[PDB]
mmCIF file of C-alpha atoms and ligand atoms in Angstrom:
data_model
loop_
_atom_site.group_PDB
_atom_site.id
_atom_site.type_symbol
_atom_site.label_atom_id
_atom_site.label_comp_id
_atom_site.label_asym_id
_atom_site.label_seq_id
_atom_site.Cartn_x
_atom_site.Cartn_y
_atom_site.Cartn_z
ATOM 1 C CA UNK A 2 67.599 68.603 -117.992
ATOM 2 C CA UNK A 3 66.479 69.604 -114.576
ATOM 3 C CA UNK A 4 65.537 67.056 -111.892
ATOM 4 C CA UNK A 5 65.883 68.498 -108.646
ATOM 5 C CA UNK A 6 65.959 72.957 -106.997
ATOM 6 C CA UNK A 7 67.472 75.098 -104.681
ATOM 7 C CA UNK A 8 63.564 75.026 -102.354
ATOM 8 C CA UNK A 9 62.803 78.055 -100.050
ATOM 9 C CA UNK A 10 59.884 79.228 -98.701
ATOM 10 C CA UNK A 11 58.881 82.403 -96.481
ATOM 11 C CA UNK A 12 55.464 80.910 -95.812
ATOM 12 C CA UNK A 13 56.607 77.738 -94.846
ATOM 13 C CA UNK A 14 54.332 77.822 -91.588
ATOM 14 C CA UNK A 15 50.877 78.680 -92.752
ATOM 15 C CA UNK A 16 51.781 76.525 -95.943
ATOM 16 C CA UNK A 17 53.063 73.683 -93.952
ATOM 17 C CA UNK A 18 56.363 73.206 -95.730
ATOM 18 C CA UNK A 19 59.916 72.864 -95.275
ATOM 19 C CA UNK A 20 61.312 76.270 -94.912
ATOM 20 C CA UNK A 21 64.418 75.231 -96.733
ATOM 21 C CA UNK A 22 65.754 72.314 -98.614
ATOM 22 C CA UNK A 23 66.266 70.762 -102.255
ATOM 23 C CA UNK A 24 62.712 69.906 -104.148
ATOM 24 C CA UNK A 25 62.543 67.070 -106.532
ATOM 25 C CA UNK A 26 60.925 68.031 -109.915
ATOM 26 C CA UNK A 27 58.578 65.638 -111.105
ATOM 27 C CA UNK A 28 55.018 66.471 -113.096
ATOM 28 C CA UNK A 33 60.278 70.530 -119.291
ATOM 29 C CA UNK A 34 61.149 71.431 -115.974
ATOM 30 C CA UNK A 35 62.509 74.729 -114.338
ATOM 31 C CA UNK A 36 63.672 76.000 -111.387
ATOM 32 C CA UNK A 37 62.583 79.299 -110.277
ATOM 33 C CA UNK A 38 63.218 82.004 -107.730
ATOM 34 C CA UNK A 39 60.655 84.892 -106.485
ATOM 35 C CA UNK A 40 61.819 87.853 -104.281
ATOM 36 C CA UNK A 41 61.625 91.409 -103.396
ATOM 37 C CA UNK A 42 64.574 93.971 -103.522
ATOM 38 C CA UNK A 43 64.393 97.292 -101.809
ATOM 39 C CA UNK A 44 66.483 99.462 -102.394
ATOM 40 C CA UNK A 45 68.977 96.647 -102.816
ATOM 41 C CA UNK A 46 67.378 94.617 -99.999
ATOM 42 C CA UNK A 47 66.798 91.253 -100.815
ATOM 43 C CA UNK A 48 64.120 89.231 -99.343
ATOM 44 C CA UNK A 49 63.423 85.713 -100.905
ATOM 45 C CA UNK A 50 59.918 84.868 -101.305
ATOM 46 C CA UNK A 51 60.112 81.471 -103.244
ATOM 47 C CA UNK A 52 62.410 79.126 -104.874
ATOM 48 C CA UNK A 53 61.979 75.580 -106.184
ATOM 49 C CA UNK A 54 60.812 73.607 -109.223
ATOM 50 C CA UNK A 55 58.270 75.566 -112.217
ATOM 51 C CA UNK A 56 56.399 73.120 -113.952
ATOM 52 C CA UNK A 57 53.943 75.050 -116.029
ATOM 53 C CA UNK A 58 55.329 75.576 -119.151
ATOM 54 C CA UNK A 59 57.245 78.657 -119.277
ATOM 55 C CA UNK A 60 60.342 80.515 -121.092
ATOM 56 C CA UNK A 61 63.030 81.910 -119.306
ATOM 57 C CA UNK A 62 65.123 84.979 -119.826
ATOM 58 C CA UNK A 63 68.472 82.621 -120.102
ATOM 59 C CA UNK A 64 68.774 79.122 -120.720
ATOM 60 C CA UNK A 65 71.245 78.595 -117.526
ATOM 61 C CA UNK A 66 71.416 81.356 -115.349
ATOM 62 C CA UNK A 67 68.150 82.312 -113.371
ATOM 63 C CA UNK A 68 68.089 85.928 -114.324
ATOM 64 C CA UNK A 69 65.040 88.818 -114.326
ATOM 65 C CA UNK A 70 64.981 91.346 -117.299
ATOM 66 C CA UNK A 71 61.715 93.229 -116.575
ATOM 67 C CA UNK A 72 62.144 96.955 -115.356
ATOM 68 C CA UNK A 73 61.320 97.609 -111.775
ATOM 69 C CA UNK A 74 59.206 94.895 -110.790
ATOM 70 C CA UNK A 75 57.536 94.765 -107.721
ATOM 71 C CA UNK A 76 58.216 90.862 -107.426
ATOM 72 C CA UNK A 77 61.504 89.538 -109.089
ATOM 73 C CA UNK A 78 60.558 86.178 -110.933
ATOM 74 C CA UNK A 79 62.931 84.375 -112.364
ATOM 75 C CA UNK A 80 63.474 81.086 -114.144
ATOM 76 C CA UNK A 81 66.514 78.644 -115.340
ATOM 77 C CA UNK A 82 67.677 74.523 -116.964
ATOM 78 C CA UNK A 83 69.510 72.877 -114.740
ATOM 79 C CA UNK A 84 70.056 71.447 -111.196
ATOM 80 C CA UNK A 85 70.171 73.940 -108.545
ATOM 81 C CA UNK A 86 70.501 76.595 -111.095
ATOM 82 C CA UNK A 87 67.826 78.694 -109.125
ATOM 83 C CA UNK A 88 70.561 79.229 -106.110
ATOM 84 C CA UNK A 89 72.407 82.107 -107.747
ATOM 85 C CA UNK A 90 69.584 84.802 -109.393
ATOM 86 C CA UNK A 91 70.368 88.320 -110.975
ATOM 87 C CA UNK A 92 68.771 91.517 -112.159
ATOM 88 C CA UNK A 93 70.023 92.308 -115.531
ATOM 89 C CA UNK A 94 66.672 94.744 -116.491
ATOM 90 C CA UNK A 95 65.929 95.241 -120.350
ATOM 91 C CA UNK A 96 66.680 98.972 -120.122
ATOM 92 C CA UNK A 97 70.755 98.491 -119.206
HETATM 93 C C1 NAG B 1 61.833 68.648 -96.874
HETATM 94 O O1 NAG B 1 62.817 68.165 -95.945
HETATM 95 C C2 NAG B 1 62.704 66.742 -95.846
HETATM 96 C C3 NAG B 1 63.527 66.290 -94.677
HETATM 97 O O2 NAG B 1 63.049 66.696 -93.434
HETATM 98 C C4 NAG B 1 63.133 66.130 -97.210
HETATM 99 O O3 NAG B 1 62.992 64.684 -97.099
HETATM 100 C C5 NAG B 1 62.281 66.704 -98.347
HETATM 101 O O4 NAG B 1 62.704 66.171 -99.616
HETATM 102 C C6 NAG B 1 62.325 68.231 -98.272
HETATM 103 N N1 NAG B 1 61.527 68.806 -99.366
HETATM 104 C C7 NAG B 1 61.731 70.072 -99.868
HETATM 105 C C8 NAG B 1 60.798 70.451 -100.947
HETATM 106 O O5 NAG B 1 62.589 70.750 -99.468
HETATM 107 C C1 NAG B 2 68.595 94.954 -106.318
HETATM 108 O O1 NAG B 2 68.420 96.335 -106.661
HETATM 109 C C2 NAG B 2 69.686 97.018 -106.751
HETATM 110 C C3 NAG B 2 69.437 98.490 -106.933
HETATM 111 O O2 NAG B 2 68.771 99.159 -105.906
HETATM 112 C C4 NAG B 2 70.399 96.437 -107.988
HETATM 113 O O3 NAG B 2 71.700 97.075 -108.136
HETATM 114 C C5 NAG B 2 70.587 94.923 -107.828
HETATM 115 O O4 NAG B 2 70.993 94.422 -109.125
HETATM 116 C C6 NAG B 2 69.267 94.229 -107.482
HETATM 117 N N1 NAG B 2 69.552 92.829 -107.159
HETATM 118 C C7 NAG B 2 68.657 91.811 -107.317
HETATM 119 C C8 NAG B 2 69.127 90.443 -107.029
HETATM 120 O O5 NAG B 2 67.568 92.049 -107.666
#
């Protein structure tokens, strides 16, 4: 149930991509979102379509459970589900 993703990139100019924009998902499909948070900082590094196979914390919402991570990563079902993403860590 997921055709199309919120797309950003940080290194869209060495990558030569849009920096921005909505990717198509061809190749199950996810959407994803990758980013740092300092101190409640938050920097995006990626979003856009996952097509490995993969298993998400939540079915809908794009949401990382791991404790502390050094790189967020998160995946969700559903068009442009990866524009809203959370940190609901395993220890709460
Ligand atoms: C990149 O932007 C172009 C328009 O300039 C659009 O046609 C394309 O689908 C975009 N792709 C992504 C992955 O954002
Ligand atoms: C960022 O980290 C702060 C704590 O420093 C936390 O309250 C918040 O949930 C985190 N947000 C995201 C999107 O990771």
């Amino acid at each position: 149930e997921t055709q199309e993703c919120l797309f950003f990139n940080a290194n869209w100019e060495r990558d030569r991509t849009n920096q921005t924009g909505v990717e198509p998902c061809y190749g199950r499909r996810h959407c994803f979102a990758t980013w740092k948070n300092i101190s409640g900082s938050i920097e995006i590094v990626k979003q856009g379509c996952w097509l490995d196979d993969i298993n998400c914390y939540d079915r809908t919402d794009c949401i990382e459970k791991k404790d502390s991570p050094e790189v967020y990563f998160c995946c969700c079902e559903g068009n442009m589900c990866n524009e809203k993403f959370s940190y609901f860590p395993e220890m709460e």
